[PDB]
């Protein structure tokens, strides 16, 4: 049997990268999945991918900076499909890559909202029908940039921080009604890694190799199943974790130091 | 000779609890203090007890929910005493412990506006004479409830979880400016404890036998001096670094579960 | 399809306990298992439970304190069934609970050889037919108490910490052949469990109500599963990693200072 | 006042890197350090150059290979100054860089003695006179090694991580006693440090510029002053924790794959 059959999933930002990754991967186990995106396009793209590989999907245009917009998604879950068992928060809007002192009040605004307090909002909403159910699956992204305090990212290396205290928080009390609360921390072959390696032909080669596996990651064939595992009887003994998904690029790091800035200036 | 002599410092919140304790043990290891509070009156008394005891202080009344408060502050230290080379960001505003799904989006705003931004701010405002000078130490302060997940501090928990982010992020690009930054996670007898204790006559007996030590923690004598190492050369080589200043209590943690909640509801 | 199918599985241990639950789990995702276990009657038993459930199974009395026993058992899953795919160190035995000062000496080297000196004669045994077939899954099995520094366990607490370093140390080389290797930290009713529960009427209770899901694990039901993931594909690029499968113990803790232990004694 | 004052240390393998950098920053603290040593020409050399600034010394020829040996020097403290309240467990003998497959028993073997036993023997030995006047602090030295995992140094990355399992569990138990261990992960030019340079002649510039402070450490203004904050009344209310002092080197990592070895091989 698949791993999530007549269980339901919403997946923000499910119209691309590591989001349509996982929204593939969970409609495979037999999930049914809100594509809560918005970008209709492919949006509406990933949701024909799923029903064309038959699985159930239903697209929901859904902004994660209006929590209007969240709990209406988690709304359409509820009605359209009869609960929402399995929550995964993986919507991302960048900032300019600048240094620290270089980035706005409006960025760091901008990544709180959309990554932070769009993982408050959802998990508020989706408790509801979980708690009713007494059966939940929380899956939360966050970042290997959290812990190596990576350059040129610190708005998102704080709101990413923020999402793994809010992840304990949960998980230590949701627990009561079988809900758990888990989040990875993944790299994979996004948006990001396609413009990074546009710009620089080199940088595949050195990504890969920065990592014991030696390898890049491939959306839905290496972060596909570790979402299925958190989203499933699998992980039902586990709760409040941080999980790795990365090749092992965790072990050695990464030096993000940008090439125009010297290493001591004292 | 003082560890922190012809060195300035500004301690948010040193009106009390910690933030005084603080305040207090570096105006005897010789540096200048600005006591940066919103409450006049225990703001000014810290003064007072450092200048009693023969140490340099300004009260500077400030309000860390507002940028433009801390960066006069900021100004404020340098131009009355000639630099700023150590800022600890300690103020804390409780919202009321109450489980997550019962937190409004208006506490979480609060907690995150007290502890998050207006640690970003000052940090910010702090490395403008900082970096001038090549030298720095900011000592943010985070909770072991971060790791924890402690039940009933579901914002402050995220907040504090962003604050070692902003922490690492800020250690690995600013050390080349010779500016560390590194995060303590204390426990001691500051308001929270006092108010604690007022309700329950058991509770400082419990508290002091839950931690290694055995012990509750004195602001001044304990969580003092391991502020005073991250402010001085002692921790000229140690930087993104977090360190639990609590007795040891981080090894066997604590159940926060509320008595009143049944541990398993399904 | 089983997540394990055509694949051959050794797991020391697997009379009881976590290792019968694991064993039993893998069997029932199409692996063959060895059952590589000490106690002749409880191995034999486990072979006849997994193959009157359908699955392949083969006890082979094993003393994981012998590198030849160890070696033969490797030989005898490659002889048997072809391969050895996966390595699960599980094996265990107790040294008295006594406070560190009064460990003797011979209880550290017991615990050192029948737990690290067992995990690294086996990783190496198993090495040379994973690397032969570019493909390994080592499932090492660590403690909470290594955390928390658990009283009354400080040798085990030093030889499972020895564990996770070495446990990091092949996910980092041995990545290049595609064999992953990750630690778990579980929590189950197993023999040692049962002892204290027939000690303690309200041991079980006490033990199930310390952590966020409220309730005990069961052997095959709870970490047999996440055994599966850190044996499978699922779990192709993450290496080097830690993992808690304990109902979320890991966040409060657990304090264990025996009750006739003054916690102040100066 | 120096911060060691009417205390005693005992530092192993004293006479040389950092262990010569602490024993010196100790002496210029106040207090009396015995030089624990195989090496009787450099221990003698350290015990003169603390004599010469001022400080209270003594060489004593120690094995930390043999219990005995530990032993005798753990009474030379107490006879000849009066106590042992510091214990720094820092010598070390390296194993060949060799892949893990390639590393022998017998280096596991003798890299478990010289840093792990090692550690609990001397722990162990130190702990009555502590015990007695209630008051200790115990300093040992892990790696960032340990948790890179990085290549060639798998049995020193497995030893060292027990020596943490081990500081964990003594801290949580001789707390009663005021008695601390804390555990320093230290980068500093050491022989090994010399060792890579005189090889590489760009090694010691890229391994400043690996970390954020931007250079390498020096044993004694870099290292000596952290172990001071953990031998020191600074430190009374820190224990069980670790701290990395290697100029922020724990948060990029490094990555230490040899140069002749293939990233991937699958
Ligand atoms: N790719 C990596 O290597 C990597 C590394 C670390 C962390 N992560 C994290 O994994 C998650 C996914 O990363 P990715 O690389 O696949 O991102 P991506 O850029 O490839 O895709 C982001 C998706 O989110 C959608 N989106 C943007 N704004 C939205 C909004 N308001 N509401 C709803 N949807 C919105 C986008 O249209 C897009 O489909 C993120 O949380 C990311 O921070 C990824
Ligand atoms: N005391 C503990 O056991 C403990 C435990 C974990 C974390 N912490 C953290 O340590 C730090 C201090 O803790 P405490 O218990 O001593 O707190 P406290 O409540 O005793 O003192 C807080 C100080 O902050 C001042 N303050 C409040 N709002 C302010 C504002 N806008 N601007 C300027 N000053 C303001 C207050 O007037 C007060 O003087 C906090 O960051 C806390 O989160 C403390
Ligand atoms: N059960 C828990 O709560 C828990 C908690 C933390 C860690 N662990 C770890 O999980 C693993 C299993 O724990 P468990 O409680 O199921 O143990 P258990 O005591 O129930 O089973 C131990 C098995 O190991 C076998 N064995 C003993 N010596 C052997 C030897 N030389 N050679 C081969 N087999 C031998 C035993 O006969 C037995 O079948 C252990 O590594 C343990 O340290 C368990
Ligand atoms: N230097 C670094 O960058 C670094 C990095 C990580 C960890 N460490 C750790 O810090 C500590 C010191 O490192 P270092 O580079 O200064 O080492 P080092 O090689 O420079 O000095 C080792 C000292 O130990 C002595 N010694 C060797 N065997 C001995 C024995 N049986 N008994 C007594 N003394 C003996 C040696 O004679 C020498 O004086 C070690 O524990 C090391 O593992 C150092
Ligand atoms: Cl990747
Ligand atoms: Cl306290
Ligand atoms: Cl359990
Ligand atoms: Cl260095």
Redesign the interface.
Known sequence: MGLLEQRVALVTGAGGGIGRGVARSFGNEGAAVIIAEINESTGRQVEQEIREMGGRSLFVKTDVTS?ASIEAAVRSAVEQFGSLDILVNNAFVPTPNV???EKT?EM?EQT?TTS??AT?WAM?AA?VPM?ER??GRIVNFYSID??????L??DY??????????????????????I?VNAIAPTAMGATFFELAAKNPEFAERS????????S?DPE???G??A??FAS?????????T??????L????????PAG??????
């Open positions: 929590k240094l620290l002192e009040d760091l709180l932070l307090w408050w508020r408790f708690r007494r059966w959290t812990e190596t305090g990576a350059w990212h610190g290396n704080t709101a990413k921080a923020g999402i793994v205290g809010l992840t304990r928080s949960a998980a230590s009390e949701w627990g009561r009604f079988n758990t890969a190799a920065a990592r014991p596996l030696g390898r990651g064939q290496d972060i199943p570790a299925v595992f009887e699998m992980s039902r003994f586990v709760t409040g974790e999980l790795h998904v990365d090749g092992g965790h072990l050695p790091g990464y030096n993000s130091r800035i010297k290493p001591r200036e004292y």
